[PDB]
């Protein structure tokens, strides 16, 4: 659960 604008996610 990372922000929509973040270039990289977590899973």
């Amino acid at each position: 659960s990372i922000g929509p604008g973040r270039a990289f996610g977590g899973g």
Partner: antibody
Amino acid sequence: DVQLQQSGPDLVKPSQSLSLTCTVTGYSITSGYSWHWIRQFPGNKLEWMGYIHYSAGTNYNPSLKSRISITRDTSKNQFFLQLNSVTTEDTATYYCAREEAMPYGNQAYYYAMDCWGQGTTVTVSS
Amino acid sequence: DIVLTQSPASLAVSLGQRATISCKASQGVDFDGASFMNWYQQKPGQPPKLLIFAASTLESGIPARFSGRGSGTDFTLNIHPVEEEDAATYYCQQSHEDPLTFGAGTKLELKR
């Protein structure tokens, strides 16, 4: 436990490159989500510079554009910061921080920069 | 870019009193019912310390006299009762998108 530490020059002449090192102790750089470089200008104004994802991929603040470069060294457990063509308006305190998964709520997660280094002052002047 | 505007730049409060700092994003920072707004406190000669993340969740080791609320574009940090060791600068930071941006900060000067 976990500890981050910056090191590098106190003085850099204009038009030169600036190389800073963030040494991470008691935690592996491959174990975290992201590793940031943030700077504070005299006046306490903060500016986020960029970060290197655990997958080695990166993202930088557009303002810094083409002058910034962040790399790492898994064997020594350190991530670096290189800034090209520095000027006096690049004098500031640099901090390297860790972004990590904060277990919150009913068994869920949220990413926050929770552990910062002491910071290292860098002055750009002739 | 998301501009976080904090008000006021500084405020004076007597210990025991209530202090309330606001922070406003130029755009909504919600997503999947979670506000990507965090708060840091920084005392002179030290690195910023995390206080609250996700608009209202407190960090470990942070006393409950610290509260944070809001959603969308308007968020506020509340201290009550204001103790002597709260004099510092408080910044709000959004993790909604890259680049991550901060607020200008709010100096909390204690009244005596």
